[PDB]
Amino acid sequence: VTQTMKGLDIQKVAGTWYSLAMAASDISLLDAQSAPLRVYVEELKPTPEGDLEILLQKWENGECAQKKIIAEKTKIPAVFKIDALNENKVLVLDTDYKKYLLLCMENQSLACQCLVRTPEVDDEALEKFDKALKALPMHIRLSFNPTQLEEQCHI
Amino acid sequence: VTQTMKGLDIQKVAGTWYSLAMAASDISLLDAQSAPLRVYVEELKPTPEGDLEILLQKWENGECAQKKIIAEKTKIPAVFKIDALNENKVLVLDTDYKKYLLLCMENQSLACQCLVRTPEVDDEALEKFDKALKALPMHIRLSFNPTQLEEQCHI
């Protein structure tokens, strides 16, 4: 992953998002509802201390569970660290704050999402996502329709 | 980790266990209630197809959440694979089935537990655990008293 957002204003990513598309380096990271990186972003909550709280939905044990994870700020503004078994980095590739945000989670092993502010298919944003991923070795890509985007876990 | 159980009968590990002691390669894997490997085993559920279901408690977002994870069998009987972002292996080091079980989760980065069948301090089992870990680079060790062992998340 050699694409970060220059000048990222993390405060400006706050609020509602929709996981419009996801991709990952390994099919098994996204293939099933229960797959480990099949997570649906609900809301980004930057903290005063500049960390990024992520609210998301994950299908776990047959139910659509709300989750909250804190990605801790690093010296690089577009890079955040999740404390888990592996060293797990969240990268903001690109965002206009108002329509779309591209972000990846890595560690090598990678998942990236195209987040949008509305439950609409944003071709422009999907173009920027496909662009960024041409640079990356992805073997599964999913996308969701507006009906799915208004449902718990995109059912 | 160069200690597996020779001759492991995975069916025989079924039932109740108590996470009497835990250790990990990195302090931050176990330090807080919310730490990523601070998990309390409730029950091991081997499947007919020889996989290992693990029921456990984890303190997440200030609540003691029940979790169920499936560690898939490999060609090695004392080694099981969890599908997650990293390649994550569960190793059965040693067990008498009736009193104690030692198991580790690795990937390098490691957490090991001394499981017991009863909410009792088993010095013999804690000796076998310390033995096995002398072989391993651990920087945090926790242990719980019988009162803690009878509580949700060992509070």
UniProtKB/Swiss-Prot annotation, chains A, B:
Gene Ontology CC annotation, any one: extracellular region
Annotated function: Primary component of whey, it binds retinol and is probably involved in the transport of that molecule.
Consequence recorded when altering Q57H: In variant C; found only in the Jersey breed
Subunit structure: Under physiological conditions beta-lactoglobulin exists as an equilibrium mixture of monomeric and dimeric forms. Interaction with LMBR1L which mediates the endocytosis of LGB has been observed in PubMed:17991420, but not in PubMed:23964685.
Disulphide-bonded residues: C64-C153, C104-C112, C104-C114
Family to which the UniProt record says this protein belongs: Belongs to the calycin superfamily. Lipocalin family.
PROSITE patterns tied to this protein: LIPOCALIN
Main location group: secreted
GO terms of molecular function: identical protein binding; long-chain fatty acid binding; retinol binding
Keyword annotations of the record: Allergen, Disulfide bond, Milk protein, Retinol-binding, Secreted, Signal, Transport
InterPro entries: Blactoglobulin, Calycin, Lipocalin, Lipocalin_CS, Lipocln_cytosolic_FA-bd_dom
Source organism of this protein record: Bos taurus (Bovine)
Subcellular localization, as worded in the UniProt entry: Secreted
Segments passing through the bilayer: none
Encoding gene per record: LGB
Keyword check for Protein biosynthesis: no
Pfam families: Lipocalin (PF00061)
The protein, known as: Beta-lactoglobulin
Modification comment: Alternate disulfide bonds occur in equal amounts in all variants examined.
Expression sites (tissue/organ): Synthesized in mammary gland and secreted in milk.
Top-level lineage group: Eukaryota
